[PDB]
């Protein structure tokens, strides 16, 4: 059962320092606590912290995160979402 191991390499691509803080909003993120992170869950912790990513903003990232096209961020998927933007540069 393999589809994409990008979520795995993500944890390895980032330093332990990132992983630690990564679990910061990981709690406040999930609203229902039994699904994943969507465009709404993002603006939440992002708006109640400092960031201000509009609808189209978050939609732009999530669109790249979800490789299958579900619009939801899985566990490790939350790490690859940033990896697709970090190294991503020419």
């Amino acid at each position: 059962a393999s589809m994409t191991d990008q979520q795995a390499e993500a944890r390895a691509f980032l330093s332990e320092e990132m992983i630690a803080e990564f679990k910061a909003a990981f709690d406040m993120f999930d609203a229902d606590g039994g699904g994943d992170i969507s465009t709404k869950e993002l603006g939440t912790v992002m708006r109640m912290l400092g960031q201000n990513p509009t609808k189209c903003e978050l939609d732009a990232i999530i669109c790249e995160v979800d490789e299958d096209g579900s619009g939801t961020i899985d566990f490790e998927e939350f790490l690859v979402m940033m990896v697709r933007q970090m190294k991503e540069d020419a």
Binding site: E21, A24, V45, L49, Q51, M82
Partner: peptide
């Protein structure tokens, strides 16, 4: 989107121990 350490560090893991 790139340097999201801000929001990530905002609440922080809150482990302490």
């Amino acid at each position: 989107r790139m340097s999201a350490d801000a929001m990530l560090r905002a609440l922080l893991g809150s482990k302490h121990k």
